[PDB]
């Protein structure tokens, strides 16, 4: 899943690559191969990552489901994980199966 | 498995598209680079690009190629859906084996032409 490319981690990577492409320091096609490999590595890393059990709640707005991927947008929603609680009035949720 | 370049089906696909877009009334000679360009598949790799150009469009049966640009080989006559009075008056081969293989792929499924073809001398039958 080329899901995690538009994340801090993934975007900083693409930007770095574009520069190298720009300066012909680094070029495309190879860039695609890196994204494939970078994306595969991040997916494997996440699979061997794992975390902790939490508890939560929300209030709905838009939803979309295509390519087995759900994309929601909640308003006035606060989510608490373990001790920490985070308030929010606009949150976008992208979820793969 | 012999020699393979990039993704399989580039040939059986380039020819077919070229055929398709030409029938769609975009009629004009083109080159493999022009097809790549228009299909946004230019990044097929120079090696494959070259192998397609030199060989794929060379093993091509009777490729009608005046020079630079590849053209339509099977149908000698332009698919103009009209006026085959030359073949009707060609009374030297009993109608010249009018085949339907090169028909029904135009705007009117032979039928529209045939009705006028029915209206005219043109006669339709099937074996």
């Amino acid at each position: 899943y080329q899901l995690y490319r538009n994340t801090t981690l993934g975007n900083s990577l693409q930007e770095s690559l574009d520069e190298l492409i720009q300066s012909q320091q680094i070029t495309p096609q190879l860039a695609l191969q890196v994204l494939l490999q970078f994306d595969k590595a991040i997916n494997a890393a996440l699979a061997q990552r794992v975390r902790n059990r939490v508890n939560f709640r929300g209030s709905l707005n838009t939803y979309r489901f295509c390519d087995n991927v759900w994309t929601f947008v909640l308003n006035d929603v606060e989510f608490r994980e373990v001790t920490e609680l985070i308030k929010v009035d606009k949150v976008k949720i992208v979820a793969c199966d | 498995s012999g020699s393979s370049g990039y993704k399989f089906g580039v040939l059986a696909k380039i020819v077919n598209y070229m055929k398709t877009r030409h029938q769609r009334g975009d009629t004009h000679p083109l080159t493999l680079d022009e097809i790549l360009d228009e299909t946004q598949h230019l990044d097929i790799g120079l090696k494959q690009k070259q192998w397609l150009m030199t060989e794929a469009l060379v093993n091509n049966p009777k490729i009608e190629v005046i020079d630079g640009k590849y053209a339509f080989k099977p149908k000698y006559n332009v698919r103009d859906k009209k006026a085959l009075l030359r073949l009707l008056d060609q009374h030297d081969q009993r109608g010249l084996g009018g085949i339907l293989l090169e028909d029904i792929e135009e705007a009117l499924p032979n039928s529209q032409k045939a009705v006028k073809a029915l209206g005219d001398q043109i006669l339709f039958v099937n074996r």
Binding site: - | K7, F8, G9, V10, A12, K13, V15, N16
Partner: protein, 88 residues
């Protein structure tokens, strides 16, 4: 000798497998199959309709239209509906 089971155990296992996948898929950007179909057709000149189905989950009738659009079926000599890319 005779018990009172409601849903036969074998039937319930089959029902669970069915609910997992539904064939009624959509068909947009239909040209991509041809990428996959030709893909396979280069490795072997011809493939039994069943082998092509094992790749395209779309309806056979509609798949046959896609197969008929870009190719022809040869008996190859032992029945076994088999499709091949046109040599032109």
């Amino acid at each position: 000798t005779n018990y009172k089971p409601v849903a036969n155990h074998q039937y319930n296992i089959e029902y669970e497998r069915k609910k997992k996948e539904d064939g009624k898929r959509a068909r947009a950007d239909k040209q991509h199959v041809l990428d996959m179909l030709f893909s396979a057709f280069e490795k072997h000149q011809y493939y039994n309709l069943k082998d092509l189905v094992d790749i395209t989950k779309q309806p056979v009738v509609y798949l046959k239209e896609i197969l008929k659009e870009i190719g022809v079926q040869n008996v190859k000599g032992i029945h076994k509906n088999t499709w091949e890319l046109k040599p032109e």
